[PDB]
Design a protein around this ligand. Structure first.
Ligand SMILES: Nc1nc2c(ncn2[C@@H]2O[C@H](COP(=O)(O)OP(=O)(O)O)[C@@H](O)[C@H]2O)c(=O)[nH]1
Ligand SMILES: Nc1nc2c(ncn2[C@@H]2O[C@H](COP(=O)(O)OP(=O)(O)O)[C@@H](O)[C@H]2O)c(=O)[nH]1
Ligand code: ALF
Ligand code: ALF
Ligand SMILES: [K+]
Ligand SMILES: [K+]
Ligand SMILES: [Mg+2]
Ligand SMILES: [Mg+2]
Lengths: 766, 766
């Protein structure tokens, strides 16, 4: 009878097994223990069956050391790195090839005529590049590129598919840009296969703008510079410097961006675009001869200075661009009358030369990263472990689940609270809430008559009306709060000096959802009304012990009121001579008035001890004249306020003296046959309420332990499952700086594997 | 200007004038004044004597003094006395033409013989006359009728109006008779005029059954006898016994009743229905002759007449009665054998014998009804003079008006209550409500940490959440309930002896109605939330006096908590030896066990006075084993609860000593360049709590006095209007037994005036 919710769950839980254990045992334990093992061993078979078919498309199985997915290893390493750390602290050490040049140059053309002319939005009229776009190029058949690493199935040779693919990239480009600028560092990941593509990662960084026009947000050019740090602070970056062939080199921006990155040109190759505009204006090949020699290019870029040319139409196909480029370069005086042989100028030579320089840098510098990340992990683990010796290995998934079980365990522990605590806490809390209402609004005005029948009649009518409207509504609220008060203590209270504060955000977050769903039984009040009516209706106290308990607790309530009034009075009247002379204090003129106003009222009560609480205006006038006769002029309102506090002090002392004789007078045996005027009807009123609330608490406790705590437990389970799926809150709640460090350690460990996997793939040559 | 009465008077006068031209008086200019022309025209109509002369002629002698002046006025006297006196004990002097008998069909026919019109319910095989039906008969324009309170005139020569009269009578009978019975004493009244009518007042009473069949309630026969004795016991009434003539004289159900109520033959006249069955010998002719002569009556009788009717139909005219008077008696033995006398054949002789003796009884007996009227008025006025010298015709209207005015005045007085009292009581009530919530849920749990900064952080977070969710709702509850308390104090019995309870019914009903109809401002809680958040942000304390005030505030709260804990502890462990060996008491086994556990925990806390609230189960086991070594075995929860109580007591004593040191330090001076041992933070918290409570109380007082108190006053006025319009609620509320005495005195006076006018007219008739 102490608790019934736990028994119900066990009974039906066994029933479920008795009917379905022959299916549950296989699914719940046998399958799950083998499930993890088969992931390593049997999924291996299905992965290999498809992988081999995919490798045949790659040709990796057919040809040793030659596989189109071999270059995809390089991108996988960077994809983890960008997710692990997209900031300069990690990005600055990641090898890459970047397209750098004046925005007007159309610098991206170096990549458009390879694969991107079909799927990347282009054309003049507006700035196209909005954020770094990385394209993973690989020798292979035509295949729809990955867009934001998302799979696609499109034909790259038909306009209808390509147009939709151009839309997809544009959406990422603009969405990466936030208010205040037109460019964003947030990168876009593309991976395309097709003929003529080289194994390398080329990034089209947003074009630099000398000045921010009114058509662009003010921070455009500063943002591009910060994005330009992808190479300016990256010793592993290869820079393709694009000179806008429409304008002279002395008008360029790229010269300063790269010359401050590598003034020796060791990390860069200079490329020129739109050279054919030289013949749409008065061509000056003598300036081109300086261009090839790098006289006017401070970065002294190394390699052959390739040139890109195009019809300028934004619909020219990749094949059309290649054919146009070859014919123009092989005949134009810009290159035929200067030392720029077309077979070195052609973009396809740049793609090969860029691919050649790409693998040179990657193999040389990649091994340094493996040592760097390993050193990082050891330094992080040493400090992380020393500050958190308890957690040698931690994850945010492990952190959440521990709380999930811990929370459910505590709420169950809350369900283990004995009724003794519930009944005492509910009874004590509820009575204290309504202890003054009865005294001030029911008892004291009823005490103004000497007719005990009216006294009991008056209160009973008020109580029944009060009972119907207030008592069960306050009682449930106390019970609802009382359960939450213990729940919070069970939930988030520390175990002395040991406490995992890392879990407090989730615990309180779970509570708020669980209390919102904690709807107390809407009919609990109806039972209490019947109970309270019966508890009040039965006023028969035939037991001395019932009398003894009721009177002592009534005294405490009255003594509390007496001190409450007395403390208010002392402030109203101030210190007496004992404290005025002891602490060198004095009275305010109001306190002086109150003391004399008190004295006159005390004298009035000294004789008229039975004076009713209500004062006649003649008494108010009499006091005023009695005080005015001593030089004290008092507003009637002061007297009435003084009167109320002093009267209760007078009354309450009388009531306690009545209580003293009620217990003592009846206690003496020979006095029980003396019918004195000591009808302790207040003890009858107090006793019934004490019993009435005690029964109320028991009804609340029964509902508390039978229905409400189970609803609280059920809601917690519903909320915790929502949190289990709510990754963002789990991240937002689990921010303890050790799980985040543990998360970083995991990512560092993964990168070390990914770094070595690619490095291991480099070592396939020997 | 400062502290000058003249400025206050000028401000009050300006505001008063603005209110005088406000919307309250603006509406009256467009709703009341424009009808003063109609009021003036009505005054001119009232001052003209034309209406008074017309009333004198119409309500007195309109050329018919005997038939008109005091026949309808006699009916009014009877109606007013029956309204005042439900019983007939006071109607002995007022004669009536009473028709009683069995369920004979001729009961309807005799009443239509005297009231010569087919106006009475007609039926077969049933007792149609459920309830008494009064008809006033007199001369006037031929075949005209009236129905009391139906606002309709009836043509007695057309079937539609006679049917309307009968159907209205039947409907009133069906409303007088409740389910389960067929009869009801409630009356139905007609006013019928025609040249064939005498100055008579007739009552159509249910026939006697003396037995109940067909599922009818067994009380029906006693109800019938009571209805019929209400008149048959009237000394001045005239009783017409309707005898069914289809049976022998030996079967007469009503003879035995009149033989006891009228053994002297002074009222009772027997009439034989279905006289055609004497011609047919269906009924014994010998007994018919003897009843005509009167040899068969065991009593004296006033007379005997024949009921000259045949089965006929409901459409048969009165002249059918004349035709039967010719045919039955010229053809039958009733004259051929001289069984019946000629004057008994005539029903006009029955009508005249009843009418003349009826008015003779009127003139003989009605006059002396003034002696009992004067005696009743004397007794009522004597009771008033002895006990209620201030009591007047305090009927449903006067007491209601006085209570309404007192209620409005007391509500205005409430509306004028000073802000000081409002704010003080609001702060005290809200502190009573929130002190233990703060102490138990914020302060104590926070106290577990030694870092006052995290203590303050947790306290502020909990306070903000409590403000957002609970605090303003408790504040609004406090304001509303405090308003209710003051409103009840004004509305309910003043705490004196002068109160007259007679207004308590209306005062309490109005209080409940206005309180339940009152609604609080919707958005007070949002302002309170913002205000309380800002006040919480205000952590700047500079005055030692605020420090000490908050110290004593939280100190008194803490001492109350400490005493509660100590009393619970004493209950848990029982009294000490000082009482065990003084009052010869002892501890229970649980009490000794708890005392030993407390001693062990005290020893533990005397080595670590800073031990946290949480206990490890190893400490529980150690205490259990120590108790075993002391002969005591305990449940872990026993130790846990003892620890809870004693540790809280210890913490409270420690906090009280901490306050004792706080009052010897201060927020700023304890910290800067001093070796303070104090580190006091509770004072700031509870000082901020004091300030927030004071600000909330002041905001609540402003909202109250601006909107809510006047809203309650307006609701009170609306409720008073509703009660004024609600006659029934006034009837039930105003049952003070003095209202009823006033109503009885007024009604006795009215019947005395009607009787005096009636008797004066009677003397004018002689
Ligand atoms: N004349 C000429 N036009 C080019 C060349 N490369 C690209 N374009 C034109 O520039 C436009 C878009 O090229 P794109 O590489 O996207 O430059 P961006 O949009 O300014 O970054 C298209 O209309 C192309 O025809 C080139 O080498 N010579
Ligand atoms: N044969 C015969 N029929 C009568 C006599 N009096 C009345 N009736 C018929 O019975 C009906 C009696 O009316 P009823 O409603 O029963 O009177 P109630 O029972 O006293 O209310 C009339 O409509 C007549 O048609 C009578 O003396 N002889
Ligand atoms: F014109 Al660009 F990136 F070169 F938008
Ligand atoms: F039949 Al009756 F009164 F209705 F005698
Ligand atoms: K452009
Ligand atoms: K009948
Ligand atoms: Mg572009
Ligand atoms: Mg009848």
């Amino acid at each position: 009878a102490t608790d019934r919710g736990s028994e119900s769950d066990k009974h039906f839980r066994k029933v479920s097994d008795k009917e379905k254990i022959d299916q549950l045992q296989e699914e719940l334990l046998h399958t799950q223990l083998k499930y993890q093992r088969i992931l390593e061993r049997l999924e291996k078979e299905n992965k290999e069956l498809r992988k081999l078919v995919l490798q045949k498309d790659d040709k990796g199985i057919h040809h040793r050391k030659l596989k189109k997915s071999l270059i995809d290893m390089y991108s996988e390493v960077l994809d983890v790195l960008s997710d692990y750390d997209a900031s300069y602290n990690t990005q600055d050490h990641l090898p890459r090839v970047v397209v750098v040049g004046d925005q007007s140059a159309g610098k991206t053309s170096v990549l458009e005529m390879i694969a991107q002319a079909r799927i990347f939005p282009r054309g003049s009229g507006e700035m196209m590049t909005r954020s770094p776009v990385k394209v993973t190029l690989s020798e292979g058949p035509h295949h729809v590129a990955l867009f934001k690493d998302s799979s696609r199935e499109f034909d790259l040779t038909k306009e209808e598919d390509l147009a939709a693919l151009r839309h997809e990239i544009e959406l990422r480009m603009r969405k990466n840009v936030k208010e205040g600028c037109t460019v964003s560092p947030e990168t876009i990941s593309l991976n395309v296969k097709g003929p003529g593509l080289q194994r390398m990662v080329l990034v089209d960084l947003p074009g630099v703008i000398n000045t921010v026009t009114s058509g662009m947000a003010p921070d455009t050019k500063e943002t591009i510079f910060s994005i330009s740090k992808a190479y300016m602070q990256n010793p592993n970056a290869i820079i393709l410097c694009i000179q806008d062939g429409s304008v002279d080199a002395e008008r360029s921006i790229v010269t300063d961006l790269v010359s401050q990155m590598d003034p020796h040109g060791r990390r860069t190759i200079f490329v020129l675009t739109k050279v054919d505009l030289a013949e749409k204006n008065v061509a000056s090949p003598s300036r081109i001869q300086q261009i090839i020699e790098g006289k006017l290019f401070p970065m002294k870029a190394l390699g052959y200075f390739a040139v890109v040319t195009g019809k300028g139409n934004s619909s020219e196909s990749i094949e059309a661009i290649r054919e146009y480029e070859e014919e123009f370069f092989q005949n134009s005086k810009l290159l035929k009358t200067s030392m720029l042989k077309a077979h070195q100028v052609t973009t396809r030579n740049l793609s090969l030369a860029v691919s050649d320089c790409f693998w040179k840098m990657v193999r040389e510098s990649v091994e340094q990263q493996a040592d760097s990340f390993k050193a990082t992990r050891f330094n992080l683990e040493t400090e992380w472990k020393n500050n958190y010796p308890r957690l040698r290995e931690l994850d945010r998934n492990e952190l959440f689940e521990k709380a999930k079980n811990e929370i459910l365990d505590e709420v169950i522990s809350l369900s283990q609270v004995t009724p003794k605590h519930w009944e005492e806490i509910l009874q004590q809390s509820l009575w204290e809430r309504v202890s003054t209402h009865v005294i001030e609004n029911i008892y004291l005005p009823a005490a103004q008559t000497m007719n005990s029948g009216t006294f009991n009649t008056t209160v009973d009518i008020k109580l029944k009306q009060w009972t119907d409207k207030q008592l069960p509504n306050k009682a449930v609220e106390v019970a609802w709060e009382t359960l939450q008060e213990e729940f919070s203590r069970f939930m988030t209270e520390p175990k002395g000096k040991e406490h995992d504060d890392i879990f407090d955000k989730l615990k309180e977050a779970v509570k708020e959802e669980s209390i919102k769903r904690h709807k107390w039984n809407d009919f609990a009040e109806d039972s209490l009304r019947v109970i309270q009516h019966n508890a009040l209706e039965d006023r028969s106290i035939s037991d001395k012990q019932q009398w003894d308990a009721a009177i002592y607790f009534m005294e405490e309530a009255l003594q509390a009121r007496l001190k409450d009034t007395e403390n208010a009075i002392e402030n109203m009247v101030g210190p007496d001579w004992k404290k005025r002379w002891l602490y060198w204090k004095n009275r305010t003129q109001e306190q002086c008035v109150h003391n004399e106003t008190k004295n006159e009222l005390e004298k009035m009560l000294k004789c008229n001890e039975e004076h009713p609480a209500y004062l006649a205006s003649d008494e108010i006038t009499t006091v005023r004249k009695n005080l005015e006769s001593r030089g004290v002029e008092v507003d009637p309102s002061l007297i009435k306020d003084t009167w109320h506090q002093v009267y209760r002090r007078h009354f309450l002392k009388t009531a306690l003296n009545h209580c003293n004789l009620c217990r003592r007078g009846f206690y003496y045996y020979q006095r029980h046959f003396v019918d004195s005027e000591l009808e302790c009807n207040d003890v009858v009123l107090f006793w019934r309420i004490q019993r009435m609330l005690a029964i109320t608490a028991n009804t609340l406790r029964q509902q508390l332990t039978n229905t409400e705590v189970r609803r609280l437990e059920k809601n917690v389970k519903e909320v915790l499952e929502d949190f289990a799926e709510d990754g963002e809150k789990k991240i937002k709640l689990l921010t303890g700086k050790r799980v985040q460090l543990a998360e970083d350690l995991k990512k560092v460990r993964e990168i070390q594997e990914k770094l070595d996997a690619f490095i291991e793939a480099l070592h396939q040559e020997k």
